[PDB]
A = this chain, B = another copy of it.
Amino acid sequence: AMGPIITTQVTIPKDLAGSIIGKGGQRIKQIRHESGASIKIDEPLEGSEDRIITITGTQDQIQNAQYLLQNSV
Residues of A within 8 A of B (CB): 3-4, 6-11, 24, 26, 43-46, 48, 50, 52, 59
Main secondary structure of the interface of A (DSSP, over half): mixed
CA distance A52 to B3 in the complex (A): 10
Q: Is the CB of A8 within 8 A of B8?
A: yes
Q: Which residue of B lies closest to A29 (CB)?
A: B43
Please indicate the chain B residues that have their CB under 8 angstroms from the CB of A4 in the complex: 11, 45, 48, 50, 52
CA distance A10 to B62 in the complex (A): 10
Closest 7 CB pairs between A and B?
A6-B9, A8-B8, A3-B50, A7-B9, A4-B50, A4-B52, A3-B11
Q: Is the CB of B9 within 8 A of A8?
A: yes
